[PDB]
Design an enzyme around this catalytic site. Structure first.
Site, PDB file in Angstrom:
ATOM      1  N   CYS A   1      -3.160   2.160   6.598  1.00  0.00           N
ATOM      2  CA  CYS A   1      -3.707   1.389   7.693  1.00  0.00           C
ATOM      3  C   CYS A   1      -4.563   2.165   8.705  1.00  0.00           C
ATOM      4  O   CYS A   1      -5.404   1.579   9.436  1.00  0.00           O
ATOM      5  CB  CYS A   1      -2.535   0.738   8.418  1.00  0.00           C
ATOM      6  SG  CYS A   1      -2.272  -0.914   7.820  1.00  0.00           S
TER       7      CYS A   1
ATOM      8  N   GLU B   1     -11.847  -3.371   8.635  1.00  0.00           N
ATOM      9  CA  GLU B   1     -10.973  -2.405   7.982  1.00  0.00           C
ATOM     10  C   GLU B   1     -11.089  -2.641   6.478  1.00  0.00           C
ATOM     11  O   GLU B   1     -10.891  -3.764   6.009  1.00  0.00           O
ATOM     12  CB  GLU B   1      -9.524  -2.549   8.443  1.00  0.00           C
ATOM     13  CG  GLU B   1      -8.606  -1.488   7.853  1.00  0.00           C
ATOM     14  CD  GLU B   1      -7.138  -1.775   8.079  1.00  0.00           C
ATOM     15  OE1 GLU B   1      -6.792  -2.942   8.345  1.00  0.00           O
ATOM     16  OE2 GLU B   1      -6.327  -0.830   7.985  1.00  0.00           O
TER      17      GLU B   1
ATOM     18  N   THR C   1       0.795  -1.226   0.000  1.00  0.00           N
ATOM     19  CA  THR C   1       0.000   0.000   0.000  1.00  0.00           C
ATOM     20  C   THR C   1       0.833   1.285   0.000  1.00  0.00           C
ATOM     21  O   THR C   1       0.495   2.264  -0.671  1.00  0.00           O
ATOM     22  CB  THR C   1      -0.918   0.033   1.242  1.00  0.00           C
ATOM     23  OG1 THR C   1      -0.178  -0.395   2.394  1.00  0.00           O
ATOM     24  CG2 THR C   1      -2.120  -0.880   1.051  1.00  0.00           C
TER      25      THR C   1
END
Ligand SMILES: Nc1ncnc2c1ncn2[C@@H]1O[C@H](COP(=O)(O)OP(=O)(O)OC[C@H]2O[C@@H](O)[C@H](O)[C@@H]2O)[C@@H](O)[C@H]1O
Ligand SMILES: Nc1ncnc2c1ncn2[C@@H]1O[C@H](COP(=O)(O)OP(=O)(O)O)[C@@H](O)[C@H]1O
Ligand SMILES: Nc1ncnc2c1ncn2[C@@H]1O[C@H](COP(=O)(O)OP(=O)(O)O)[C@@H](O)[C@H]1O
Ligand SMILES: Nc1ncnc2c1ncn2[C@@H]1O[C@H](COP(=O)(O)OP(=O)(O)O)[C@@H](O)[C@H]1O
Lengths: 455, 453, 456, 455
Positions: B252, B341, B120
Site C-alpha cells: 500500500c 494508486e 497483497t
C-alpha cells in the site's frame, strides 16, 4: 412548506454547526502554541467564574445532586484538567529524537462529536471543550435531553470565552433541541471525524456502529474491599465523602463494600458514627421497591438526598443521615442493592478473607461494571499486590475514594470525566481520555538502515 | 436430520467453532508467565523464518502477485524485525511502577482478536499479526481474502503448530478456510469477538468501525514523493526503484508519483533510465492508461505484475532489463489513471517549480485515496525538509529512504508493522504502525495522594 | 441438542432444500391435465377426512389449545366445504372464452407458495392452504408455529403422501420442522419463493409485506356483535354460544363483545344463563381480568382453555356445566382487558341505548386490534340491519349467524377459508376470504379489435 | 444538489399525507353522483390540457414527441374515463338475493403514486381518475427528470376536482423528488396502498415497504410473425406501435421473430414502410450507445431514429422511421436483445413455431417475464399453440403491442400500470384499474346450521 418538525429542524442545525466547525478548525490549526494556550486559559478561567451558576443550573434542570458539589465538579474540569494539559505541546514538532533520526508532530483529529451525560452535564462540557481545543480540534456537543439547556449554556460560555481570546466562531457548538435524528446525523456525517461517547451502553454501541473512530465509556459498579489491615476510620471517612459527592452521581462512585469478618463490627460502628443509617430488613425491601423499575435503575432516586429517598420509600430517617446502607448476600440484576445505584445507597457484604472478597467483586463487576473501577483499603502491601493484580478495571483505587480516584482528583491518573473501560467494557481504550487521545502522532523518520537485495 | 451444503452456512459455523476454541485457548494462555509466553512467541518466529520461502511461493502461485524472492524477504521482515521489536516488551502482570506518583501499571489482554488479511501481503501479515497478538496474550482468528485463501490458512497453520509445540493451547490461532461476507460479518459482530484488526480496502474498514466493536483500521496509500534539488539524485533514484519495484509494487505504501524540481529534471530522467526505468511516450501512455482503470477502479490484472507483463497487456513492446514503467503527467484526479494508486511498477512523473508547487500537487494527490498514510521526500537541506513536511497529513513522513521500506519500519525508525493506521483523516482510530502494545489494555493501581476540599 | 446452537443454520439450509425440491415438482405439476390435477386434490381431501380426528388430537395434545371434537370439525371443514367450493374450478389452460370481446383467459400458477401456519389452527390451515395451492398447480412450503411444529409437520406429510398416491411428485408439499425467524426470513426472501400466505400475528404479517415478495396477509379480529331489539333472542344466544365456544374460542372471527339494546337487556341475560353462560360479579371480573394480560398483551396461557380451567387459574368458582364466561363492561381499550381480543370462552357484555350508540362503540372496539376483520349483528328489521352494517370496516359482516362459522364461510355464503384478509385498513392487499383464485395469475389473449388514431 | 432538499421534501410528503388524510375522509362521505361529477370534471380538464402537458413532458424529459404524448394524455382522459365512469363504487354495489349476500364498496384510503419518467403526465391523469373514482386520496412522486410536468399534471387534476366539489389536498405531488421522500412516502403511517409504476429497483422497494403494493415489471416484448401472417398489415401495425412516442411505453415491440419462409417479404415490407436495416458496421456503432455501463443508455430513450443515428455517428435518410438490426444472440451483453425503449428493433430469423417459442422465452427472461408478447398470424391453430405457454399477462394477437398492452386496441382494461403477475414479482397480472382501489365488504346471511358433533 418550511421545515416544521423537530427531528428535521435539528438535522438542519447539526449540519450548519459542522460546516462552521470545519472552517473554524482550519483557522485554529494554523495558530501557534502560545495563541492556542491563551485561548485555552481564557476558557478555563471563564469556566472558573461560571462554575457555581452552571452548577446551580444543572441542579435546577436535572434534579440530581446539590449545588456545592456540582460547583466543585465544574472546577475540577476548569482547574485540574486545565493544569494537566496547559503545558502539553500540541503544536508543531512535539518531540525530536536526534540519535534515532525521528521526530514527532502533533496532528488534530479535526472535528469531535461530544455526547454529554445528564449526571455531569456542565463539567463534562468543560473537560471536553478544554482538551479538544488544546489539541486544535473543533467540537459539536449533543446533550442528554433532560439537561439540554445547562449543557448548551456551558458550551456557550466556552465558545464566547474562546472567542474573546481570538478564536474563530463555530469552534464550539451544541445541539439545542436533542433528537434521535440529530444524534445519528452528528455521529455519521462525513465531516465528523471522531466520537467521544460518554453515555449509557446503548449510545456507546451506536457510536461504535457509526462508521467512525470512537472513544466510548462503560457503566460502573464499583466494589471496594476493606482488608483487616485497613485504617478503618480513615477508610470509612474517605469512602463516605466520595460516595455522597453530588449524592453519588458519578459512575466510579462506590456501590458495594466487601469487609473482612474480623473488623466487621468496627466498620459498621465507624459508619454509623460518621452518618450512615443501616436499613433493617423491613426498610430494605421498601427501599428496594423503588430502586428498580422494570429491569433497570429508577431515575427518580438518582442523585437524590437520602431524606428524599426516605420519603419516597415511605420510611423515616434522621435529617442528619449522610447515606443509607443495607447488608446483602446475593448478587444479581434482580437484587436491586447489588446493582449500580447512582445515589447515596451502599450495599454491605461480609467476607471471610481475601479470596471471598475477590470472588464477590468479580461477581459484582460482571453486573455492568466491567473494565471500569475497583477499590481496596489496606495497609498490607502483599495483600494489595495480590488483590489488585487480576481485577478487570482500568482504575484500581488504593486507599482513596473511588469517585475522586477514578477521575484523577485524589490519585495520580490523568484528570478526566470520560473513563474508558477497555475492550471488556466495549471500549477501544481503558484510559482516562485526555488531550493525547485527540491528536494523532506523525513521525518524520530518516533512512538509517539499508535494505538487503539478496537472501 | 443432519445436513448442510451452502458454503455460507458452513463458513458461519466454522467461525463459531473457532471463536469458542479461541476463547478457551486464550484463558489458558492468559495464565502463563512472561517467560512461557516469550518462548511461544520465539517458536512462531523461528518457524516463520524457515517457511518464509515456501509460504512466499504459495502466495505468488495462488494470487499471481509479485515474486518469491521479495515475498520471502517480506515474510522475513515479519519473522525478524517485528519479532525483535516485541520480544523484549513486558506484557505479563505489572509492567510499570511510578514510585514518586504512587501508580503502577498492569497489562490486560483484550481477549479475542479478529485479523482481516489483504490479498497483497497475505502470508507476511498473518505472521506479523500472530506475533503481536500472542505476545500480548490474546487468541486470534484470521479471515483470508478469497484470492489468497489457501496460503493464508497455511500461514496460520504453521504458527499454531509452531506455537503448540512450544506449549500453546489448541485453538489459539485459527483461520476461516472459505471466506464469505456472511462469515466475515459473523466474525466481526459475534459475542466472543473482542477487537478487530482490519487490514484491507476502505469497504472492509468502514464495516469494521460499524460492527459495534472496538477496531483498528487502515487506509489506502497514494504516496507522493518529492525530489528536492538538494537531493543526492543517484542515491534517491536507487532507493526509489528498490522500494517501488519490491514485490512488483504490491504494498500500500509504494511510491505512486514523483514530484521533481524543474532545476534537476534532466539529471533525474537520465538517472532513472540508467537504473532501469522505461519512459512511456504519450502514445504508449494512453495505451497503458487504458488498462490501469476499468469502469470503475484499479485493474486487478496489473496489480503486482512485472512490467513486461503489463507492457504486453497494453500492447506495447519493451526491453527485458527494464525494471519499471514511467509516464509523464500534469493532471491529478480519478479521471486520470496515472494519478491514482497503481499497486504495480508504474510511476507518475510531475515537474514542479519548487516546494510550494510540490506541496500543492502532493496535497491533491493524497486527497485521492492517500490521506493519513505515507509521504516521502529526498533532500539534504534540513530547512526545506522541515518546511515541506510539517503540514503533510500522513502518519509516516519518510526522509531519504524508500517509502515501501520506510512506511513499514524496515529502513526508517518507525515501529515494524504491516498495518499502518491513518489517523482520523483516514477514518482510523490511530496513526501508529500497529504493534504489540495496541493489543493489551493498561490497568492502573493508583494510591490516595491528596485530600479533597 | 448438542448442536442445537446452529439450529438457525440447519433450518435455513432445510428451507433451501425444500424450495429447490418445490421448484422441480411444480415444473412437472404445471404440465398435468385438469383431470390429473383434480384427481390429486380429491385424494388429498379424502386423506384429510380420514385422518381428521387423529390430527385434531395431536394439535390439542401439542398446543394445549382447544378440544378434540371441535378441531376434528375444523379439519373436516377444510376437507369438505373448502374442497367442494373448489372441485369444479378450472385452473389448467384456457378457463374462459369471451368471443364477442375476442378475449380468452389462460391460468398461470404463481409458482412456489410460502405458507405460514398459526398455533390455533395448525392442522386445519395446512389442509386448507394445501388444497387451494395444489388445485391452482403450485408447490407450497410450510412454516409452522414453534408451539405447533410436530402436528403441523404431520398434516403436511399426510397431504403430500396422499397427493403422491394419486400421482403427485415428491417435494410438492413440505414443512419446516424447526421454525425460526432465521428460517422464516429465509423462506420469505429466498429467490425461489413467489408468493407469501401469512396467517399469523401482526408482526409476522407486516414482515411478509416487507419481504420484497407479493404477499397475502391477515389481521387480528375483535369481533363486536350487535343484538338489536328486533332480534330473535333465543335463536341468537344459541348461535353466539356455539360460535364463541367452538374450539374454546381460538377462531379469530369468534365473538369478543356483545352490544345489547337496553330495552331487551333482561331477556338476553336470562337466556344466556340458561344456555350455559356464567355472569361474573364485579370482583370475579377483576381476578379474571388480572390474568387476561401479561406484559401489555394477551396471556398465551388462557388461550383456548376451557371455562373451568380459566376459572381455576383466576382463583374463582363456577359450576362444571358452565360453557362460557360473560362480564359486564362499559369501557374500551388496551387498559380494559375485557375489551380486547381474548381468544378464549370469555365475552364482554355492553349495554347500548340503540343502534347509533352500538355503532359508535362497534367502531371503537374494532380500532382496538380488529380493523377490517369481522363484525356481527342479530336483527329482524332489514332497514336497521342495512343502516348498521353499511359503514363498518370489516370484510365479513355477519347477519343472524355465529361469527366464527360465518366469518370462514361455513354458515353464510362467503367463500370457505381459514385465511381472512383484512383489506387495506388492516394492512392487507385484499379483504377477501383467500381462496384458489388468489393463487394463480390470469393471462389474457386479446385480439386487435380497434384502431389507434394516427393524426390528432 | 442542495444540502437540505431532502428534509424539506420529507416535510412536503408529510404535509400532503396529512391533508390527504383529512380530504379522503370528507370525499368518502359523498354520494355516487357527487363523486362521478368530480371525476368527469377531472377528465374534462385532462382533455383540455392534453397538448400543453404533452409539450412540457417532451421538453423536460427529452423523450418522445408532442403529438403522441398528446394522444397519450387523451387515452387517459377518454378511454380510461369511459371504462370506469359507470362502475359503482359507493355503498352497496351488488345484492345477490338467492345466495343472500350484499357487496359494499370500501376505499383503501390513501394511495402513494409513483410516476415513471417515460409517461409522466398521462400516468398522473390515469391514476388520479381511478383513485378518486374509488373515493381515495392520492399523493404522487415523480421521477426527478420529469418533476415539473408531473407536478403540473397533478395540479390541474386537483383544481378540476375542486370546482366540482372535491376537498383541498385530495391530489398532491412531490415537487422535489428524492429517495428520502419516496422512502418516507412508502412507509409512512398514513399510507394505505402503494402504486409503483417505475423501474425494477423501486418496485422491489415497494414490496419491501411493509405496505400492500401494486407493482409493475419491465417489458421486453417479442412478436412472432408466422408465415400465415398478413405481412403488409402486420408491419404497418408494428411500426405504428413501435414508433409511438418514439417507443417509450414499456410494452413496445423489442424484437421480431420471423419465419424464414417469409423473411424476404417481411424485410422488404419493413423497408417499404420506413425501416432502416443496419449493416454489420452500423450495427456495431449503434450497439455501442444502446447501453452505458451495463444498463440502458438514457440519451437514446424516446429519441427519433435520426437523433440516435447521429449519436452513434452514422447517417441515415431523414425519412427513416425506425432502425432494424438482424440478430442471433440473446443476452444482457447483446444490447439489441434487451428492452430498448426507442425506435430500434432486433430482427430474428427462425425456422418455425418451436424455435420462435424458445427464443421468445429467452427474451422474456431478459427482463420481460409476465409482461407482454405478440403474434401476427391468421392461422388459428398456431396462435392457440403458440400462446398457451407464454409467461405474460398480455398476449397480443394481430395488433401492435403498445396499444394492445395498454388496452387501447385489444380488450384489456385501459391502463398505464401493467402488472406482471407472480413471475414478475407482482400481486397481479391485470391491467390495474379502479376495482383494485377499493376492497369489498360482504354482508352475508345465515343459511346453514353448524352441526356440533361428528360421528
Ligand atoms: N414482535 C414480533 N416480531 C416478529 N414476529 C413476531 C412477533 N410476535 C409474534 N411473532 C411471530 O409469531 C410467532 C410468535 O407469536 P406469539 O406472539 O408468541 O404467539 P402467541 O400464541 O400469542 O404466544 C405463544 C407463544 O409466546 C410465548 O409467550 C408462549 O409461551 C408461546 O411460545 C413467531 O413465530 C413469530 O414469527
Ligand atoms: N436526546 C437524546 N440524546 C441521546 N440519546 C438519547 C436521547 N434521548 C434518548 N436517548 C437514548 O434513549 C435512552 C434514554 O434513557 P436515559 O435517559 O438514559 O434513562 P436512564 O437514565 O434511566 O438510563 C438512552 O439509551 C439514550 O442513549
Ligand atoms: N477477506 C475478505 N472477505 C470478503 N470480502 C473482501 C475481503 N477482503 C476484501 N473484500 C472485498 O473486496 C474488495 C477488495 O478489492 P478487490 O478489487 O477485490 O482487490 P484490489 O482492489 O485489492 O485489487 C474490498 O473493497 C472488499 O469489499
Ligand atoms: N423514485 C425515485 N426518485 C428519484 N430517483 C430515482 C427513483 N427511482 C430510481 N431513481 C434513480 O434513477 C436512476 C435510474 O433510472 P432508470 O430507472 O434507469 O430510468 P429509465 O427507466 O429511464 O431507464 C438512478 O440514478 C436512481 O437513483
Amino acid at each position: 412548506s418550511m421545515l416544521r418538525d423537530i427531528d428535521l429542524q435539528s438535522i438542519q442545525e447539526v449540519r450548519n454547526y459542522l460546516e462552521e466547525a470545519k472552517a473554524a478548525q482550519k483557522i485554529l490549526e494554523k495558530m501557534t502554541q502560545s495563541e492556542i494556550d491563551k485561548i485555552v486559559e481564557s476558557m478555563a478561567n471563564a469556566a472558573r467564574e461560571e462554575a457555581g451558576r452552571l452548577a446551580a443550573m444543572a441542579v435546577e434542570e436535572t434534579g440530581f445532586g446539590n449545588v456545592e458539589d456540582k460547583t466543585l465538579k465544574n472546577l475540577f474540569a476548569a482547574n485540574d484538567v486545565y493544569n494537566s494539559i496547559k503545558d502539553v505541546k500540541t503544536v508543531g514538532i512535539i518531540r525530536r529524537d536526534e540519535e534515532n533520526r525521528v521526530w514527532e508532530i502533533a496532528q488534530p483529529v479535526g472535528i469531535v462529536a461530544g455526547i454529554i451525560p445528564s449526571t455531569n452535564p456542565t463539567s463534562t462540557v468543560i473537560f471536553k471543550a478544554l482538551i479538544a481545543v488544546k489539541a486544535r480540534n473543533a467540537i459539536v456537543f449533543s446533550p442528554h435531553p433532560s439537561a439540554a439547556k445547562c449543557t448548551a449554556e456551558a458550551a456557550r460560555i466556552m465558545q464566547e470565552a474562546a472567542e474573546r481570546a481570538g478564536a474563530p466562531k463555530g469552534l464550539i457548538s451544541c445541539i439545542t433541541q436533542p433528537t434521535m435524528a440529530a444524534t445519528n446525523e452528528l455521529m455519521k456525517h462525513k465531516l465528523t471525524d471522531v466520537i467521544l461517547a460518554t453515555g449509557g451502553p446503548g449510545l456507546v454501541k451506536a457510536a461504535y456502529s457509526s462508521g467512525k473512530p470512537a472513544y466510548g465509556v462503560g457503566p460502573g459498579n464499583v466494589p471496594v474491599y476493606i482488608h483487616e489491615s485497613a485504617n478503618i476510620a480513615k477508610a470509612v471517612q474517605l469512602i463516605i465523602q466520595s460516595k455522597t459527592f453530588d449524592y453519588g452521581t458519578i459512575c466510579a462512585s462506590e456501590q458495594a463494600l466487601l469487609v473482612d469478618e474480623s473488623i466487621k463490627e468496627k466498620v459498621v460502628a465507624e459508619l454509623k458514627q460518621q452518618g450512615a443509617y443501616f436499613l433493617n430488613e423491613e426498610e430494605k425491601q421498601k427501599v428496594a421497591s423503588i430502586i428498580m423499575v422494570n429491569g433497570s435503575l429508577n431515575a427518580k432516586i438518582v442523585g437524590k438526598a437520602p431524606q428524599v429517598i426516605a420519603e419516597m420509600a415511605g420510611i423515616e430517617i434522621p435529617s442528619d443521615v449522610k447515606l443509607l446502607v443495607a447488608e446483602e448476600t446475593e448478587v444479581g440484576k434482580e437484587y436491586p442493592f447489588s446493582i449500580e445505584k447512582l445515589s447515596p445507597i451502599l450495599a454491605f457484604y461480609i467476607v471471610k478473607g481475601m479470596e471471598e472478597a475477590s470472588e464477590l467483586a468479580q461477581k459484582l463487576l460482571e453486573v455492568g461494571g466491567l473494565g471500569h473501577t475497583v477499590g481496596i483499603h489496606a495497609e498490607d502491601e502483599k495483600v494489595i499486590e495480590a488483590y489488585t493484580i487480576d481485577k478487570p478495571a482500568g482504575r484500581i483505587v488504593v486507599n482513596a475514594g473511588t469517585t475522586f480516584g477514578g477521575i484523577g482528583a485524589t490519585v495520580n491518573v490523568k484528570p478526566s470525566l470520560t473513563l474508558g473501560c477497555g475492550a471488556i467494557g466495549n471500549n477501544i481504550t481503558s484510559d482516562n481520555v485526555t488531550v493525547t487521545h485527540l491528536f494523532n502522532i506523525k513521525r518524520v523518520a530518516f533512512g538509517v538502515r539499508e535494505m538487503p537485495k539478496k537472501v
